[PDB]
Structure 1
Amino acid sequence: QAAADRRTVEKTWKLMDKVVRLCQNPKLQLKNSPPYILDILPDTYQHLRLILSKYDDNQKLAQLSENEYFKIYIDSLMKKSKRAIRLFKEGKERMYEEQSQDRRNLTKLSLIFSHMLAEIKAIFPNGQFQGDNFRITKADAAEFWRKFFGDKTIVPWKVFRQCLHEVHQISSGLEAMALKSTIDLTCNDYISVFEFDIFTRLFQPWGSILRNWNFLAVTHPGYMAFLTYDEVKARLQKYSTKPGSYIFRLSCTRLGQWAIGYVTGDGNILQTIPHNKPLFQALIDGSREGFYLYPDGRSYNPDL
């Protein structure tokens, strides 16, 4: 990780600007729906401009430029922005085909950028680095983080995996690789305390977290990962005549929280946020009551 001096941070601004120009192409017919690069990248430049404003003398810039998280962040942003630029160049006319693999990769990158924005606003609230004070929401998860990493804001994946394995054993590399793609929202091969917080909130309780993660995100056909409210309604339309069809999903706008969509006996699509109980438990309760019967339309619910 190169040092994050103002020259480097500015070089990243120019790259993001290219991505914004490329995404303004009308032939693209880009829909205003989260994650929306034309919101995320400008807001990211703004937050970076804020951070740099605070580190105004030369002993502050030495702090910021040497900040391990910030060094990693700026390097990711530059790599992801170069990737996006490469995507349009190599994708050429295939970028206007709203269903092409080139546009799907652009959507993948827009999620990442969105996750990176939420992270930096969390780690640098109001441009001031607060990474070592970040309060992990689940207490037993926070015990784990402080025990093995203490004050750190960001941790190499390999380090994180070995320490997690001491407490919750991973069965295989394929599992570890699926776990990585789940926890590592920003796809930078690191685990920040923000990503850890999102993960242990989604798949609580900590004491059985890997079982919960497998049950919800690996083996459950009802899991849909990131969808907007409208996208949930759209996907369930084909099942509006099959009450009990349901899916559950995440929101890139409100990380760390689950939502469920399901079809009522009348053929209506309702969506609900399970406040104050783990998702696997809401699904188990929901199944018994007769609401959550056919995950994504299949004919049986996965075995608890």
Structure 2
Amino acid sequence: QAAADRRTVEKTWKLMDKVVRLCQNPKLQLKNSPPYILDILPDTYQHLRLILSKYDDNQKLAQLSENEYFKIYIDSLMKKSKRAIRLFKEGKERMYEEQSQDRRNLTKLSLIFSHMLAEIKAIFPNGQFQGDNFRITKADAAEFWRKFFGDKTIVPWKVFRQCLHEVHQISSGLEAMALKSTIDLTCNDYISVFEFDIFTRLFQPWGSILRNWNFLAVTHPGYMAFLTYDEVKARLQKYSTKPGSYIFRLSCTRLGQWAIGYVTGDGNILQTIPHNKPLFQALIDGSREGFYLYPDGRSYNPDLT
């Protein structure tokens, strides 16, 4: 909402920088696994600088400043930067307690920051705005976005909800809340064409996407949200004697992709990343084929409703 001129960006990097200072303290004993906030933030500044030089060398600092996605973006960075600053300040020594709510928030902000990097890289590839040129991966999902939002690259949660409701009935405010949590990756109360793309790749097919999303991310014991490759394997160890035990996760380095971990007949733990097939189909097929039987070790897979 505040123009994105250099004056306004640097106030944003100061705060970002501030977050790096707080986080680079080795006392934190930050676990070395993605998302690596200390890599993400600088990487984020590097891309913001790359952008500025594209619109300086082209003398279009004007447009950039008045681009709505970009204005929202850097305002978001400020918001989250200030939020983490506040987290260390109010959190005090909780920030050195791994199993602390405040440290969970830190992990959540790091996730958010990582998503914002993937998003900005996607709509400003090589430093140039391509938001209006972002081709969505799933055809039926692409049809929806362009029909209701044309070439817009970002749109408020309120309107994304109202428009989605026209094609996919959103039963109540509570379901909306939950759906927002899933799709609003960057946690800025807007839905970007990138976020939509990720969401629709994950919960395809479009035609029953809320049903799919409910089955997969709301009611499914197997759904681990974001976890590392190692956390999935470690969490499955205890079911080694139970072939067909499985969980699935999102990857923060490969947004829009799923990873399934399961226990083989000979007690081994493998991982698989679906490429051609959508997760929803992969799970159902695999349950019938005898590989995906016990989600997070539970006795039965969930019903489809």
Shared topology, TM-score over 0.5? Answer: yes
Point out 4+ residue stretches in structure 1 off by more than 2 angstroms: none
- Cα displacement (A) at 1:180: 0.5
Q: Comparing 205-214 with 271-280, which one deviates more in the overlay?
A: 271-280
Q: After superposition, what is the alpha-carbon deviation per residue over 1:198-226, rounded to whole angstroms, capped at 9, x for unaligned?
A: 01111111111111111101111111111
Q: Deviations over 1:136-164 (max 9, x none)?
A: 01111111111111010000110110000
Distance 1:96 1:115 in 2: 25
Question: Please, which moves more after superposition, 275-284 or 78-87?
Answer: 275-284
**Which consecutive residues of structure 2, in runs of 5 or more, have no partner in the other structure?**
none
Instruction: Select between 28-37 and 274-283 the one with higher mean Cα deviation.
Output: 274-283
The CA deviation at 1:267 is 1.4
Give, in angstroms, the shift of residue 52 of structure 1. Answer: 0.7
> Taking structure 1 as reference, are residues 58 and 275 closer, same or farther at Cα in structure 2, changes over 3 Å only?
closer
User: Partners of 2:281 and 2:144 in 1: how far apart?
Assistant: 24
Q: Distance in 1 between matches of 2:297 and 2:105?
A: 27
1:24-81 CA-to-partner distances (Å, cap 9, x unmatched) read 1111001111111011001001001111111116951110011000000000000100
CA deviation after TM superposition for structure 1 residue 234, in Å = 1.1
Q: Please give the secondary structure, in 2, of the residue aligned with 1:55.
A: helix
**Pairwise CA distance, 1:241:** 2.3
The alpha-carbon distance between structure 1 residues 18 and 275, as it changes in their structure 2 partners (threshold 3 A), is same
Q: Does 1:277 align with 2:277?
A: yes
What is the 5 A alignment of 1:229-248? 229-248=229-248
- Match of 1:221, SS? coil
CA distance in 1: counterparts of 2:46 and 2:58, whole angstroms: 22
CA–CA distance in structure 2, aligned partners of residues 77 and 19 of structure 1: 11
Distance 1:269 1:189 in 2: 38
Distance 2:286 2:144 in 1: 31
Q: Distance in 1 between matches of 2:141 and 2:274?
A: 21
Shift in Å at residue 192 of structure 1?
Answer: 0.5
Name the stretch that deviates more: 14-23 or 53-62. 53-62
Cα distance in 1 between the residues matched to 2:78 and 2:147: 32
Q: Give 1:278 shift.
A: 1.7
Aligned residue in 2 for 1:21: 21
1:275 & 1:188 partners in 2: Cα distance?
29
Q: Is the 8 A contact 2:80 2:109 kept in 1?
A: yes
CA deviations 1:85-138 (Å, max 9, x no partner) are 111111111101111111100000000000000000001001111100000011
1:280: how far off? 1.6
Aligned: 1:212 with 2:215: no
Q: Is the 8 A contact 2:204 2:280 kept in 1?
A: no
Output the CA distance in 2 between the equivalents of 1:266 and 1:6: 59
Q: What is the percentage of aligned positions where both structures have the same residue? A: 100
Q: Residue in 2 aligned with 1:12?
A: 12
**Structure 1: how far apart are the matches of 2:273 and 2:76?**
32
1 CA distance for matches of 2:9 and 2:223? 37
Per mean C-alpha deviation after superposition, the further-off stretch among 231-240 and 123-132 is 231-240
Equivalent residues of 2:122, 2:194 under 8 A apart: yes
Q: Retained in 1: the 8 A contact 2:22–2:88?
A: yes
Structure 1: unaligned runs, 5 residues or longer: none
